[PDB]
Design a protein around this nucleic acid. Structure first.
Ligand SMILES: [Mg+2]
Ligand SMILES: [Mg+2]
Ligand SMILES: [Mg+2]
Ligand SMILES: [Mg+2]
Ligand SMILES: [Zn+2]
Ligand SMILES: [Zn+2]
Ligand SMILES: [Zn+2]
Ligand SMILES: [Zn+2]
Ligand SMILES: [Zn+2]
Ligand SMILES: [Zn+2]
Lengths: 65, 64
RNA sequence: AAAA
RNA sequence: AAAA
């Protein structure tokens, strides 16, 4: 099985590539909420600053705007 | 299991051949960076010259 | 076939 | 449901 490279933005409802079971965490990859089992991305967010407050990508300290 | 001939350009989601865990090295198969453990492709690059500064395929001194 |  |  190969990972879908488009997830969490895959537009093919019949995509045969691997999608994580759990939806992406809307707190971002840097989510520190205890017990949160949503999928936390490891891919860094490309926006500087990022102003999407439901961005699932991984942010550094100060990257949020 | 044998290696995938098509990786990193394998479009078969059910591909049985093994795909390396590490992504291809952005420096190309000719990478000389010490300690670099990204996957260094062996198959040569067709583009003469390559224009992709992140082509993972193997180049030569006069393929810039 | 998700605009480099 | 296709990353500003
Ligand atoms: Mg694109
Ligand atoms: Mg197109
Ligand atoms: Mg868009
Ligand atoms: Mg886009
Ligand atoms: Zn997909
Ligand atoms: Zn979370
Ligand atoms: Zn972001
Ligand atoms: Zn393959
Ligand atoms: Zn390398
Ligand atoms: Zn090349």
């Amino acid at each position: 099985e190969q990972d879908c490279k488009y997830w969490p933005n895959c537009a093919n409802p019949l995509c045969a590539f691997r999608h994580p079971t759990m939806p992406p965490c809307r707190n971002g990859g840097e989510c520190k909420v205890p017990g949160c089992k949503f999928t936390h991305l490891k891919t860094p967010c490309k926006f500087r600053p990022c102003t999407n407050r439901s961005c699932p990508f991984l942010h550094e300290e100060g990257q949020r705007g």
